């Protein structure tokens, strides 16, 4: 199947990136305004915004490193079986981010749309953590 | 083979986007500082920056719409045979951008790196044209 890979260096502690993306306080700055959940493996993280707030079920948590989750909701099976991985690795004086959004059937409209969006959110994650522009 | 697709809406005339990416004055604001060429089909556009300024040979030009080019230089054949397409289509009160960077052999490090970068440059293209933040 087709997968989407993004990569970005961020000058911030793996702890900062991890917590930011595993807490409501961090996520409400990153993704959107209305966000609930942000619990542990087995639980569901609820995102809400105008257009279609996604729901993400937590499948794996590694302290200050790798986080992985699977899409949840009433979407077609192909979307329900979609998994997403977020890996961290410390490089020199910064933390290198490796994001993977996998499980694509074919080159549909959603693919390119999400592909671009993901990198923009990463850029925001970078500037927010490094400077505080977010 | 593997290809990379990005998509972004920009509230600006197809003429503005076209010219910006076909003139030195526009490119020197978009991509990097030191840029030369920006000629017609058959010619080579020269980008220069610290890390590896690319050279892009123009293969097709459509007025205020589709621009396509092919990588040039002393890179391996797989890179020399790499082509890139930039399509425009007017949607409602704005212009919709469709960017394709194709000709990837395998999921190497360069793939994810370029993938993320492309979306960032598009975002910059958007804010510059709409507001003037660039």
CA distances from B92 to B20, B73, B131 (A): 21, 40, 19
Domain of B76 in residue numbering reads as 1-134
Choose the mutation target among B2, B5, B97, B101 for the interface with A, i.e. most A CBs under 10 Å.
Answer: B5
- Say what the alpha-carbon torsion angle A35, A7, A131, B49 is, to the nearest 10 degrees: -150
Cβ contact (<8 Å) for B112 and A118? Answer: no
How many domains is chain A partitioned into structurally?
1
What is the token pair recorded at A94?
Answer: 């910064």
Q: Give B10's strand partners.
A: B95
Contacts 24+ apart (CB under 8 A), A25-29: A29/A128, A29/A134
Q: Find residues 87-116 of chain B whose CB sits inside 8 Å of chain A.
A: 98, 107, 109, 111-113, 115-116
Tokens of residue B59, six digits: 């293969």
Task: Give yes or no for a contact between A57 and A75, defined as CB atoms under 8 angstroms apart.
Answer: no
A52: domain CATH number? 3.30.530.20
Whether the Cβ atoms of residue B123 and residue B9 lie closer than 8 Å to each other: no
3-state secondary structure of B131: coil
User: What is the CB-side half-sphere exposure of residue A35 using CA atoms within 13 A?
Assistant: 20
The reply to whether residue B120 touches residue A115, judged by beta carbons under 8 angstroms, is no
Q: Kindly state the helix (H) or strand (E) to which residue B56 belongs, with its residue range.
A: strand B55-61
Secondary structure (DSSP) of A60-129:
EE-TTS-EEEEEESS--HHHHT-EEEEEEEEETTEEEEEEEEEEE-S--HHHHHHHHHHHHHHHHHHHHH
Contact B116 A4 (CB under 8 A): no
**Residues B105, B110, B111, B114: is their CA dihedral positive or negative?**
negative
SS3 B66: coil
Query: The tokens of A72 are what?
Result: 């949840």
CB-count burial class (<10 Å; 0-12, 13-18, 19+) for B93: exposed
């Amino acid at each position: 199947m087709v997968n989407i890979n993004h990569r970005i260096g961020i000058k911030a502690s793996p702890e900062k990136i991890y917590q930011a993306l595993t807490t409501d306080d961090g996520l409400k700055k990153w993704w959107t305004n209305d966000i609930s959940g942000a619990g542990v493996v087995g639980s569901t993280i609820k995102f809400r915004f105008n257009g279609g707030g996604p729901d993400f079920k937590v499948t794996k948590l590694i302290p200050n490193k790798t986080v992985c989750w699977q899409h949840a909701g009433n979407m077609p099976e192909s979307w329900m079986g979609t998994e997403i991985s977020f890996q961290l690795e410390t490089v020199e004086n910064q933390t290198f981010v490796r994001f993977t959004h996998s499980n694509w059937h074919e080159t549909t409209d959603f693919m390119a749309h999400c592909n671009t969006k993901w990198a923009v959110f990463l850029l925001s994650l970078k500037d927010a953590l490094e400077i505080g522009k977010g």
